[PDB]
A paper describes a structure:
A key component in the generation of cellular energy is the F1Fo ATP synthase, a biological rotary motor that converts proton motive force (pmf) to adenosine tri-phosphate (ATP) in both oxidative phosphorylation and photophosphorylation. The enzyme is based on two rotary motors, termed F1 and Fo, that are coupled together by two stalks: a central rotor stalk and a peripheral stator stalk. The central stalk is comprised of subunits ε and γ and rotates during the enzyme’s catalytic cycle. E. coli and other related bacteria exploit an internal subunit, termed ε, that can sense the environment and inhibit the enzyme under certain conditions.
Here we present cryo-EM data showing E. coli F1Fo ATP synthase in different rotational and inhibited sub-states, observed following incubation with 10 mM MgATP. Masked 3D classification focusing on the central rotor highlighted sub-states in which the εCTD adopted either a condensed down conformation or an extended half-up conformation. In this study we observed the εCTD in two conformations, a half-up and a down sub-state. Strikingly, the improved detail in this study shows that the transition of the εCTD to a down sub-state is associated with a substantial torsional flexing of the central stalk, as evident by rotation of the εNTD about the γ subunit. The sub-states of State 2 showed the best detail for the two εCTD conformations and allowed the c subunits to be assigned to Fo rotational sub-states based on their interaction with the εNTD, assuming that the c-ring remains bound during rotation, which is likely because the interface between the ring and central rotor has a buried surface of ~1200 Å230. When the State 2 εCTD half-up and down structures were compared additional clear differences beyond the εCTD up and down conformation were observed. When aligned on the stator a subunit, the Fo ring rotates the equivalent of two c subunits in a clockwise direction when viewed from the membrane (akin to the synthesis direction). This rotation of the Fo motor was facilitated mainly by a twisting of the central stalk (~50°), but also by flexing of the peripheral stalk (~15°), with the remainder facilitated by small rearrangements within the complex. When the εCTD is in the down conformation, the central stalk is no longer stabilized by the εCTH1:γ interaction, likely increasing its torsional freedom, and the εNTD rotates relative to the γ subunit. When the εCTD subunit is in the down conformation, εCTH1 can no longer bridge between the εNTD and the γ subunit, thereby enabling the complex to open up to an unclamped conformation and allow a greater degree of flexible coupling between the F1 and Fo motors.
Residue numbers in the entry:
A (entry chain O), B (entry chain P), C (entry chain I), D (entry chain Q), E (entry chain L), F (entry chain J), ...: 3 to 79
H (entry chain R): 3 to 78
K (entry chain X), L (entry chain Y): 1 to 52
M (entry chain a): 4 to 269
N (entry chain H): 3 to 136
The structure:
Amino acid sequence: NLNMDLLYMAAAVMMGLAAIGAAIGIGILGGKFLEGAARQPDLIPLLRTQFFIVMGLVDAIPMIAVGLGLYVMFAVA
Amino acid sequence: NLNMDLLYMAAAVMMGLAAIGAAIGIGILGGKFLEGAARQPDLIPLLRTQFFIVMGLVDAIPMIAVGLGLYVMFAVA
Amino acid sequence: NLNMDLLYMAAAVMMGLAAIGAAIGIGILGGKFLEGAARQPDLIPLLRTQFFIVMGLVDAIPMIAVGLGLYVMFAVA
Amino acid sequence: NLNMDLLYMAAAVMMGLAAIGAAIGIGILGGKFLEGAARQPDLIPLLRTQFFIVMGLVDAIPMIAVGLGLYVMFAVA
Amino acid sequence: NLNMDLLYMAAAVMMGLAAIGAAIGIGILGGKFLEGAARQPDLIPLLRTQFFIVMGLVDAIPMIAVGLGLYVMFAVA
Amino acid sequence: NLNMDLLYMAAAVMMGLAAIGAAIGIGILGGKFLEGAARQPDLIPLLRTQFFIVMGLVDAIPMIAVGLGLYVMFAVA
Amino acid sequence: NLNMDLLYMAAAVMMGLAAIGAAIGIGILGGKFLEGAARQPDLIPLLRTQFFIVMGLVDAIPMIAVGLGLYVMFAVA
Amino acid sequence: NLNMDLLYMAAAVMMGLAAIGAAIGIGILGGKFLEGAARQPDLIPLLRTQFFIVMGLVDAIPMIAVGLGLYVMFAV
Amino acid sequence: NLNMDLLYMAAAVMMGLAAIGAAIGIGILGGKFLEGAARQPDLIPLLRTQFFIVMGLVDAIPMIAVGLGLYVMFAVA
Amino acid sequence: NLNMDLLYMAAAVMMGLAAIGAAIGIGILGGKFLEGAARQPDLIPLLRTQFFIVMGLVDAIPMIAVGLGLYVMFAVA
Amino acid sequence: MNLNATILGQAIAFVLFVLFCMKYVWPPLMAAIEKRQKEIADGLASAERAHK
Amino acid sequence: MNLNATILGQAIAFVLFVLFCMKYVWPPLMAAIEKRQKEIADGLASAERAHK
Amino acid sequence: ENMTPQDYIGHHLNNLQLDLRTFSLVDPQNPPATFWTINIDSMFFSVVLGLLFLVLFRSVAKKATSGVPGKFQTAIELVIGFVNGSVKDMYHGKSKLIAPLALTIFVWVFLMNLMDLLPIDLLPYIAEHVLGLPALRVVPSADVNVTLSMALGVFILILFYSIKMKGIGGFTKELTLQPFNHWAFIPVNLILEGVSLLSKPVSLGLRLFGNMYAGELIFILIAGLLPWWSQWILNVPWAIFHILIITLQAFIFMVLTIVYLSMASE
Amino acid sequence: TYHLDVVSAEQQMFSGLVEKIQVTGSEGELGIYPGHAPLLTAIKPGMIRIVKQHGHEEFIYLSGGILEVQPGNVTVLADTAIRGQDLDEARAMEAKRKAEEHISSSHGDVDYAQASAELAKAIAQLRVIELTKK
């Protein structure tokens, strides 16, 4: 039966979009980190610690989406 | 086909657009945290508690979409 | 059967588009609050009040879209 | 079957795109209000009266699109 | 007579795309007004006049799309 | 028959996307005029001249898309 | 037959995407001119010449797309 | 038959999104030229040279999509 | 047959959106490096260090997407 | 015939989306180079060496997609 | 929703409340406030006159 | 679904809503009215003190 | 009682109507088809809320003292001062209409929105069981016809002020000549300024309706879908939010009325 | 080309026509040309490179100041400035000694605000004395 081709398409939509959100959201957040280490280089280990606190939130919803896309393709399909 | 495969496609659209929305909204918000944290390096505990107040609201509406996407795949399909 | 089975796809479109709109708009709005909180930190309890005023204006059209999405899945489908 | 199905689909696209329009457009506008609140806080009651003028025009066009979305579900069925 | 069903779909994409352009255009245009008012608050009735002169051009094409799309939905359908 | 279904939808996508580009382009170009009118009063009529020169070039390709969507709608279908 | 309706649909999406790209691309470029003229009107004759030297390359690709949209709609028909 | 209208549609998606990509990347790029031009006016001939160096990079992929958009359209 | 054919369309959407995610997110981050290097050219060896630290987080998700797009295209095919 | 007519649409999605990613990512990146060269023309050669380093990171993933979009269209046909 | 004559009956109700509010409610209320504002201003003038 | 039960849940949701009016909403208005009778008292009383 | 949750949502979204032919209290099982079927609930609650507005303010205006006000009188002059201060901000002409028009729009549209906060079944239950009327919904501004009735009312004032304060000569110049100036563009300008004219009242009614209709629909859904033990955790956070909506939507209909009538003449 | 005037309350530090200058600024170091951007700014602790006709540089310490480049007569105003051979490379290495000692001898926030300026003065000296060797 044909049905199994749509399950690769559904993981493709789910995992590509979470690659848009996890890449641009760290790009925006990460550039402001660099700007603050260019102007204020006495702060780099603290800003780099705070960057890891806020970066953990940014990719969480993308990490669920990438885990379900791998489950759909390998486990279900 | 048409029952199961569309419910995964509905889940993909719900949990992919929530990945776009919950990631970029926290990148925009989280970059203003780290620049404030570079200008006022004694304020960072005050700004991160403001960041958590504001961050709850931004995530809250995408969380409806992520939880309901999990419901549509597992409970409905 | 395709009639109800597509409505879950209609709700997915409606409440996913609302989630990207509401999360990005509150992320922009919240970024201008945290930078206001870094320039005038003596000021935060005033500015955060103004944030909850206009945040109430940002969510008004998304929250009825999410509500109608839930209605389409649970009351119509 | 699929006449009444597709009417609910057409309201989803209409109300979903209006939910992005209203949310994003007040996010941008309300963030520029908050930065004028941060810069000159004693001036907030003047700028706030300017924000409600401007903000009403922003939503006027998304709110005839949402209103016709509810018309297509509730009146046209 | 299948014809009616697409025409509501054709009206929805006109009024959805009009509400995006006419809401984000007035959001960019008006947020620059509010920083001009934040800088020069005695000018505000001067800048209101320029904002109303420019805001009529932003709404040239979208009030045609809301015009013909609301036509399509009632007159033709 | 099948012809008018698709030919409205083709005009709808044409004048819908034109409604994005002319509204966003005059929003960005007009807000930069209004900071220049706020920043340099005494020059409003000179800047307004430049804004109308530049606005005629922004509206060029979107007005061909309107004129051919009016053609498809009221001439071809 | 069905081929002509989809050729009008092809010319409509091609000219619409050209209309967005060419009009947002000149609204950015021209907003930078109007700020640099606002900075110094003595360079209105000098920038407005660099403006057209640059604005030719903005309109390079969108008039291949408009040139082939017109060809599809009038000569493939 | 159905084969040809789907080719005219697929050329329309390549040659449209190349129109977004080549247009917005040169607005972003050429706006930074103009403010740099308004900033260092005597350097305009020096900065204009680097603008063409980077413009060849920006246009590099949109001209692959326009060369294949004309192939799918006319040569097959 | 579609069980071969759709898998190339399913990989095209994975390696399109992985390419928009990784290219825009590095452009935002990399441009913030380039202004910091122009303002603070003494720090270039420091900021380049931090750029390569943060750059590898931006690529963590877009290389899941492109490695699965290569796997879907060639292994399952 | 029926098989090949959709492999030109798997190619069109990879090279549309990689052409938007590669162009806008280099436009963000290259505009920040022209900023820094307007601050420090003597660093127009130094920043140029950073630009070509960083630009090779930016358009690496878009060229895997522009390669496989040319493989599909001319080797799977 | 239902296109309805309620639009016309409510336009009578709206107009009649604006005519009675315009005549009867608003002139007497504003009289009472502004008369109090004048009393406060005459208090200011009276203090200056005392020290003169 | 029984409808009496939903009216019970609506009662619980109303009681909790009143308490939010009472806990935080009740002060701002009665403060403003009381601060307008302190405002108008001190405006008038200063006019009386100017008569004295 | 076989109320399904979909049927419960159904009957609640059906107003009570009366035919100008039969004079008959229709019910949700079958809707008749004619224009002349007044929505009984909206007229009665609207005038009742508008009467209560006038009875409160007259009971103070007939007695108001320029001494220190009493604690009720002070609540009324706070709203008078708020309305007068917002008119004074955005209107300089001499007209005796704009100030009381702005007052009645603010306090009436506020009182109409206030109905939405009450428990969704309280008044509809009493009307079916105690009285016996087939249907009810109790929020007047959650129905289009009244919101358009006020928005067309403001429209006719926009035309009266634009004709009166600048004459048909001036009004015909602004309609044709702007925004593109040259007489070559006149045929286009009458569409753009005509649709901009027409959009101002269309935005007024549909801004207020869309908020208030979809607000009440959320209270119908939480009561219709969720089991009683669980409703309060979704109903309580929405009512606290909708207190902000009911005030600002009343305030925006006031403000944009003043702005449209004020920028019409000057 | 253009004429540069550099002064402090203690002396006129330079004055004459100059071909290019690279100058400290508020956000970062800045490059100047004939008809350069007509800009006034505050300056960070740093220095200025004075490339004259025939291409001859000289190096002036700018411990603090404000500048103007709008007219063809441009101007730096220095709250303190020192000529590049009245300072020495050994003197700036001693400046490193004081800054590093006060970093060890500062422990609050108010004293760190002075010790940070004492460091910045040393670091800007340590910069110009290396540039001075060209």
